[PDB]
């Protein structure tokens, strides 16, 4: 990722990645196989699609594999996925 994205204002939590925005807001989630709760991010090894975008960003798209993996993808043209799609990028 980019430097001047990269988190200097919060203290994120383990297994979680952290995004700041141009509004200098901060937003950090939890990596994918594993679920938000009160500041922690818990183990969630076999999450699905329907439970909150399966930890993919908001404006992707969420596929299960035949694996039963997840797989995020970042639909917008030139967007491409950061932490494997937890959020979309342009470049």
Known sequence: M???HRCIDTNVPEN???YRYLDGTEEWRCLLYFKEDAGKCVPAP???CKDKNGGCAPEAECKMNDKNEIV???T???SEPLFE???C???
């Open 46 to 48: 076999n999450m699905t």
């Open 85 to 87: 799609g937890v959020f």
């Open 89 to 91: 990028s342009h470049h």
């Open 76 to 78: 917008k043209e030139g």
């Open 16 to 18: 979680a990645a952290c």
């Open 2 to 4: 980019s430097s001047e």
């Open 72 to 74: 995020c993808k970042c």
